[PDB]
Symmetry: D2
Subunit: 340 residues, 4 copies
């Protein structure tokens, strides 16, 4: 069989919409017929070769692909044909290293990454490791659930690792694909939410989604503003694609506060070490979520506590989508629609 897929063939170059072979599931693998496929900013970082470790070219991006199991290889019991599943960033892990045994498979040094080290969901079919797919809730449609496979699970786990508790303040910095669902997870977890971004439209979205307080970092120093407005936050989750946002986040917390980092812009951010030590501050990287995190994050969507703000596009318009996302012209998430 042949399928349409969007392929990266050179860093910085436009993706090509090609006819390519349909991947077939070997022993212990499954095939997924894609119905929707979220576009994550990581897909841009990948196509641009922003990161120190680059993807092997050529490859099909996409780690928010969701659909139906369409074929099953031998030795598969976790899922069966017809099951609704998603294939997230964590494509597989080895299952028995120290991290894996501890339930931290997101740290597995042997992991594969969907739409980066193996082909992903910007295509009609993808082959997956059924041990690591998301099992989707019946009550949510493919387009709406697609962003939970990366944006949702990532911010959910990120918020968990801020070590905040109900009634405390959390700042979400960057109200984009990740950030706009972070506001909702944070509210679902009993947190009071402050929003920071550099575009009023994104702050307006945060407001509609439950923020409480919001500030535009292009209009004022957001750290100073938050110290005055809420007395500093207990936690911050940084989903921004700007190193400057990372530095500013450090100044947003109360003493003892924790800044969790999801954003992956290239380079360093300036860190005020003296203050971090004097004020007992924690800065913590957070990387997607484990299968447990993923299933939990999906249940929030199923219960209606989180709903992604989504616009759809066709596979053939991926390059325009990438452009708009680069320019910061996307509200929430774009999700590629493969439905009939």
């Amino acid at each position: 069989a042949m399928m349409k897929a969007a392929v990266v063939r050179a860093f910085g170059a436009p993706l090509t919409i090609d006819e390519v072979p349909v991947p077939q599931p070997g022993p212990g693998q499954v095939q997924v017929k894609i119905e929707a496929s979220g576009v994550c900013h990581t897909d841009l970082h990948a196509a641009d070769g922003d990161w120190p470790v680059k993807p092997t070219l050529p490859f099909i991006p996409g780690h928010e692909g969701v659909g139906y199991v369409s074929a099953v290889g031998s030795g598969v019991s976790r899922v069966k044909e017809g099951d609704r599943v998603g294939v997230p960033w964590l494509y597989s892990a080895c299952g028995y290293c120290e991290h894996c045994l501890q339930g931290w498979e997101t740290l597995c040094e042997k992991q594969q990454n969907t739409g980066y080290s193996v082909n992903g969901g910007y295509g009609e079919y993808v082959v997956a490791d059924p041990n690591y797919v998301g099992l989707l809730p019946d009550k949510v449609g493919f387009v709406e659930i697609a962003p939970i496979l990366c944006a949702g699970v990532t911010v959910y786990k990120g918020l968990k690792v801020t070590d905040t508790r109900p009634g405390q303040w959390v700042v979400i910095s960057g109200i984009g694909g990740l950030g706009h669902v972070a506001v909702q997870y944070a509210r679902a977890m009993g947190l009071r939410v402050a929003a920071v971004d550099i575009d009023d439209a994104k702050l307006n979205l945060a407001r509609r989604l439950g923020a409480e307080v919001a500030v535009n970092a292009r209009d004022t120093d957001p750290a100073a503003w938050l110290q005055k407005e809420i007395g500093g936050a207990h936690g911050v989750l940084v989903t921004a694609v700007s190193p400057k946002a990372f530095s500013q986040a450090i100044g947003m917390v109360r003493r003892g506060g924790t800044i969790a980092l999801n954003g992956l812009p290239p380079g360093d951010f300036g860190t005020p070490i003296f203050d971090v030590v004097l004020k007992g501050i924690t800065i913590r990287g957070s990387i997607v979520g484990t299968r447990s995190d993923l299933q939990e994050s999906l249940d929030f969507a199923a219960h209606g506590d989180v709903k992604a703000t989504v616009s759809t596009a066709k596979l053939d318009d991926v390059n325009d989508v990438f452009g708009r996302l680069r320019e910061g012209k996307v509200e929430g998430r774009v999700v590629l629609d493969f439905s009939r």
Copy 2:
């Protein structure tokens, strides 16, 4: 009525040994007759006024004073005349704020600091808040115990907040004034210790103190070496906080690990976003400790698990001591001896 004390009357200027009034305790205060008084680099910063918030002038430095309660004010129950006590960096906290109520008085924004914001132990007597003094173990001498009020509690608490557990690996980065004490606490906490420094003498010492591995960073890349040999460390305690040490800690730690920063350096440090995020690293600031941390740290000294390298000097030679300290000639810790 009068006592000898070393006084800072001008930032940067030699200290003067002066005759000054003996401070007398009011309601809820106690008076301590100093028998030994530790010296460290913090005293240089106090005396130079080069930190963001300066001491008020004039003042008597010293946050490592140990002695006997020589007088009490009214309404004092925690200690009584003749008790052996130390007057550490945390002189007092407000008792009522969010932090104090949670047992995190080190984060109190209203705290007073001994030998910095109030007079300290470079004098024959000092007035203290009995609610915050350290209660010293009976069987350890004054000169030996003094640095535990500073180096001891700092590295003990720093080790606690690496979130490591018995059997796991910790790197002690820097085997100097703090580092040589940290190796001992780490071993007493059941940790496997890897010592990292550029001085073979210090590394040979770390081995004497129980380090399982010692790497000289002049000769070998400790990040590459530790990743290969032990798979990276679960925790890193950075006791000499330089940009180089900070970067190398990011390299040495295993994914999911925690780096505790135990020192107060000048300037912003460049923090690599990709590494911290993808490796799920925690970076945490930690200096000194709460009253409970301090009492816990004193117990290890009492049981013979931890002994600071100590040398003595007289009060009248404090400037010679400051000079030796500034020139990096001090091995271990110098302690002023007020003994008959």
Copy 3:
């Protein structure tokens, strides 16, 4: 010089409504003029002389007293005359034992208890330690806020120590004074709630306050019912005044689950140790809350996440109130109102 108070002159015998002297505040004390005063099931036992350790006669009960600071002794800085305050079970603690230093003043062996070991708020005025009073929110009336001083802080802390997290299931066992507010704190903390009691009126209260599911332990086995209904709970909070139910709670949890205990009926409860070990279950007692817990629990009431269901009564009718409470004829809480 004189005031009305309900006094326990002799155990087991109805309380006498007397005119007794007004207590005056000495140094470090404050006087509080009572506006409302909650009735806890605990007060029944104080009055009976029931528990292992008894009050000393004669005494005035009441540790849900709220009002205004009417007089201040010397050396008091936390509060001033006219401040809105409440005087909870934890009247005072020593401030410096291991528990106190660790922010667990509720475990202080030197604690005094309001309306038990020292006089409480079943009277027009009460003298208190300002270091331990609750600081009340302006926007909640006295009658409504009174139960937060014990019912509220207790179940708030109890829920914290079930170690459950948002999205997980908690069972509230016993929907009385404590229980009806526990349902509300649990929802504010992001938990899914199930209710257990022996009366459908009490279950309906719970359903109206946010419980998703409910069951009558007289109609059917609640443990078996819950295992079927929700697949077992991640946590249970037992506020019941029955040793049974304490036994039944253990059967409601998933493997690895935690049962927190607030209720204080006399005697033992039967514990299936084999299952507790096999299933990795935790059983944990929880005693009121620290000052930090109290302030947090008051904040939820301030923000309107929690609102006690309350009936008022006059001091003079205390004994009638005791009867109804004893017979399970109270909905939520009864609060003595001193309103003119």
Copy 4:
């Protein structure tokens, strides 16, 4: 094709040593050639069919078998021929449930148990699931390491779940088969150890293994004595879970402390509500451990920190061993030796 094994063919009967077919590994399975096989009281419960859910007959007991991988089925990568491995109580878990995904496979309701629900190591060969075997340290002989698969991991994990930390006090209650191993882990974990038993010889042993204090409960009330001496223990590990040991643990633990129950006794135990609640005590069941706990526990044996007292026996004499065990004549652990 054939091998000797000890088989239970009727509950309570002597075991019969039979010639039986050598089990051959299918896909995903490995075969282990047994070199040593630990015996413990759990094997008596398996052979007697004592517990709520019985073994199916007939079966080969033994959940402490260690040896070499002798054959590897298809699709096995974790181990290879010649690897030294143990086959512990947790034979396999489902891999997919809430507990398995969270790294708590010991809570898997679908787990299989070696030498209980599937054949175990009282035979020359056994077939195992490679994903769940213990990977044995190179330094330690088969006979010495065998009990670590059971006593070792159980007491190690039990100590971890007391939530104690270096410098704190733990009581090891019972210094027998489990308890003498627990004293050694506790010391290696930096805990101060108080031993409690009624046997002076076992108490002497505890002292020689590093216990700081030892109390004979025949002669002195260890609850009263420990409260007086050490102010109560932060944790209590109860290795012989009798009603008396359990109630005394409640008396020995300091307020806020944690009691870990390490054994599977018959019947309900009476738990004092008042003491557990007022003292804020945690009681927690814990037996064996996850794959991560097992590997961590094996590391302590590898480093020489823990050594079980072991004597050997031949497979043919397993009934004489069961006899000694039932009569209470076994000191330490007995391990069947299959070596040539």
